[PDB]
Amino acid sequence: WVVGMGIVMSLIVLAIVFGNVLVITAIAKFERLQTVTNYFITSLACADLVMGLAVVPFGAAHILMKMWTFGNFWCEFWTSIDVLCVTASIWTLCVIAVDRYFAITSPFKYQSLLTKNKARVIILMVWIVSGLTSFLPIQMHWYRATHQEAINCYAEETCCDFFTNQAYAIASSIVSFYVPLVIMVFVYSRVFQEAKRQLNIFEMLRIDEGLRLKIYKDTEGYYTIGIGHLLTKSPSLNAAKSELDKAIGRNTNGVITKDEAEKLFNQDVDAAVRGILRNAKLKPVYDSLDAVRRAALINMVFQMGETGVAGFTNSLRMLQQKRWDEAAVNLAKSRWYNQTPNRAKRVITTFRTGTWDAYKFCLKEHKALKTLGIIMGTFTLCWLPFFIVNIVHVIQDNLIRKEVYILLNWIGYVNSGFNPLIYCRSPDFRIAFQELLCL
Ligand SMILES: CC(C)CCC[C@@H](C)[C@H]1CC[C@H]2[C@H]3CC=C4C[C@@H](O)CC[C@]4(C)[C@H]3CC[C@]12C
Ligand SMILES: CC(C)CCC[C@@H](C)[C@H]1CC[C@H]2[C@H]3CC=C4C[C@@H](O)CC[C@]4(C)[C@H]3CC[C@]12C
Ligand SMILES: CCCCCCCC/C=C/CCCCCCCC(=O)OC[C@@H](O)CO
Ligand SMILES: CCCCCCCC/C=C\CCCCCCCC(=O)OC[C@@H](O)CO
Ligand SMILES: Cc1ccc(OC[C@@H](O)[C@H](C)NC(C)C)c2c1CCC2
């Protein structure tokens, strides 16, 4: 039996040390990844590497030998490192949560206000103040119980069980774990409530149309560029480049920069907007509508044009009478729905509900924020049960088996391995692991 547990614990160390050295490396080697956010991810990663190299392995021998075969000085140091890694890991997570907040309520949506050099200072501090609070109590012995079982364990060098007093237990938990946890969950629930709130026409058309900086063919077969900017219906590729160079104002050779796709895009959206106000059949509907349904209208006119969207004679009349569901059935009865299936579905849903729900997590910068959520969410699942139990042991010390304590603690330990897997959501990371691994 015990041989079976050794493999598990051995396998587990390897994954933490493989997985995280890989994350640290990626970020260290590929400029594309050197960002404020991924600098904190490095801070997390290291926490886990120290967890995997210096904590988990000795925890593992502790169990199987049923004793502490490593001496007093280490035991003390081993426990202070253990605390350090969890303390630093929640505070980093919390600090990411606050960074993404200030980033998303700025007009530089999605970018950190922090510069790189400031990113490093925060991290140093988070580690120093984590370090002092994690090492001092343990070394200065402020953590020590005064009952017979505990004073006996402190003397025995083969004994290294985590006996502490309750003023240490409750204080440290709160300042080290509950405080930053509660702020993380609270602040980062607001980051989602903002991603959704600040969805607008531009991001919606960005999700629906995508982005291509070369010349390509839409489903009709016509020549398009940018965020769905149409150039010419004629099947002549030079006619495409003819209109492009015209539309930009330079020699282009069938290729354009992002600071030109965006300024074409903003003329196409203004074009669509002026079309709705110019056209008699559309204008009166558009004024009845709220901001979110108005976006759904502009989307349509982007795709078909004023003429075409005016043709939906029934659907428009209903929309104006706020009869959302009926009119959503008409728009399903359309050449439009048939040709482009998904785009239609998402647009109609917006008319239907008056909410951005169909574009939940569709934008790339929002998928980036979901991934960040999971890293947080998973910490909370993996460590919280243990930290509640550590606190329900202080109110009635006769209530939870040491076998339960060790299990729940090791769920903590096993959380260090999950962050790297979760990063294989990001393409930026998925490619970085690949070059590194030599796949
Ligand atoms: C294992 C125990 C005893 C000691 C480990 C703590 C120290 C040495 C480690 C853990 C995390 C580390 C790093 C985390 C990320 C940044 C990013 C980089 O661009 C500057 C270095 C910097 C700021 C590091 C500073 C040193 C650091 C704080
Ligand atoms: C007691 C045991 C577990 C020791 C563990 C120490 C390891 C994990 C620490 C000590 C110093 C650390 C860091 C030193 C400088 C930074 C610069 C940064 O931009 C990339 C990561 C990098 C290079 C870190 C990698 C992890 C690191 C090497
Ligand atoms: C449990 C199953 C999961 C897998 C466990 C496998 C075994 C453990 C590996 C040891 C850690 C160190 C290995 C990580 C080093 C990778 C990076 C490096 O080799 O990349 C070089 C680069 O400069 C080129 O582009
Ligand atoms: C990859 C992460 C780290 C891996 C590192 C693994 C090192 C150990 C090697 C195998 C067993 C050694 C041989 C066993 C020799 C004596 C066994 C003894 O009888 O064990 C008593 C005890 O376990 C009763 O409770
Ligand atoms: C601030 C803090 C940080 C981490 C904590 O537990 C980590 C857990 O691996 C413990 C150390 N392992 C024992 C079995 C030794 C705890 C605190 C407060 C007390 C419990």
Domain boundaries, the chain: 1-199+360-439, 200-359
**422 alpha carbon to ligand 2 midpoint, in Å?**
21
Experimental method: X-ray
66, 72, 78, 83 alpha-carbon torsion, rounded to 10°: 100
Does 31 qualify as catalytic in the annotation?
A: no
**49 alpha carbon to ligand 5 midpoint, in Å?**
17
Pocket-forming residues, ligand 3, beta carbon under 6 Å: 11, 14-15, 17-18, 21-22, 25, 435-436
Q: How far, in Å, CA of 331 to CA of 312, rounded? A: 8
Q: How far, in Å, CA of 434 to CA of 187, rounded? A: 34
Instruction: State which of 162, 174, 389, 414 you would mutate to test the pocket of ligand 5, scoring each by most atoms of that ligand within 8 A of its C-beta.
Output: 162
Q: What order of strands is seen across the sheet that includes strand 229-232?
A: 212-217, 223-226, 229-232
Q: Which amino acid is at 215?
A: I
Q: Which amino acid is at 252?
A: T
Residue nearest to atom 6 of ligand 3 (CA): 18
Residue nearest to atom 24 of ligand 3 (CA): 436
CATH 3.40.50.12500 at 1-199+360-439, yes or no: no
Q: How far, in Å, CA of 87 to CA of 130, rounded? A: 6
Q: How far, in Å, CA of 382 to CA of 302, rounded? A: 47
1-199+360-439 and 200-359 agree in CATH topology: no
Instruction: State which of 43, 49, 58, 129 you would mutate to test the pocket of ligand 1, scoring each by most atoms of that ligand within 8 A of its C-beta.
Output: 43
Three-state SS annotation for the chain: CHHHHHHHHHHHHHHHHHHHHHHHHHHHHCHHHCCHHHHHHHHHHHHHHHHHHHHHHHHHHHHHHCCCCCCHHHHHHHHHHHHHHHHHHHHHHHHHHHHHHHHHCCCCCCCCCCCHHHHHHHHHHHHHHHHHHHHHHHHCCCCCCCCHHHHHHHHCCCCCCCCCCHHHHHHHHHHHHHHHHHHHHHHHHHHHHHHHHCCCHHHHHHHHHCCEEEEEECCCCCEEEECCEEEECCCCHHHHHHHHHHHHCCCCCCECCHHHHHHHHHHHHHHHHHHHHHCCCCHHHHHHCCHHHHHHHHHHHHHCCHHHHHCCHHHHHHHHCCCHHHHHHHHHCCHHHHHCHHHHHHHHHHHHHCCHHHHCCCCHHHHHHHHHHHHHHHHHHHHHHHHHHHHHCCCCCCCCCHHHHHHHHHHHHHHHHHHHHHHCCCHHHHHHHHHHHCC
Catalytic site residue from 99, 208, 209, 260: 209
Q: Is 123 in the pocket of ligand 1 (CB under 6 A)?
A: yes
Return phi, psi of residue 281, to 5°.
-75, -30
Give the residue carrying structure tokens 């980033």.
103
Are 296 and 308 in contact, with CB atoms under 8 Å apart?
no
On the 0-12 / 13-18 / 19+ scale of CB atoms within 10 A, 25 is middle
Are 13 and 56 in contact, with CB atoms under 8 Å apart?
yes
Give the number of other Cβ atoms within 10 Å of residue 328's Cβ. 18
108 known ligand binder: no
Residue nearest to atom 1 of ligand 1 (CA): 50
CA-nearest of 363, 354, 90 to 204 is 363
Does 435 qualify as catalytic in the annotation?
A: no
Are 436 and 428 in contact, with CB atoms under 8 Å apart?
no
Are 94 and 184 in contact, with CB atoms under 8 Å apart?
yes
CATH topology of domain 200-359: Lysozyme (1.10.530)
**1 alpha carbon to ligand 4 midpoint, in Å?**
13
Instruction: Tell me, in Å, the resolution of the deposited structure.
Output: 2.8
Q: Is 124 in the pocket of ligand 1 (CB under 6 A)?
A: yes
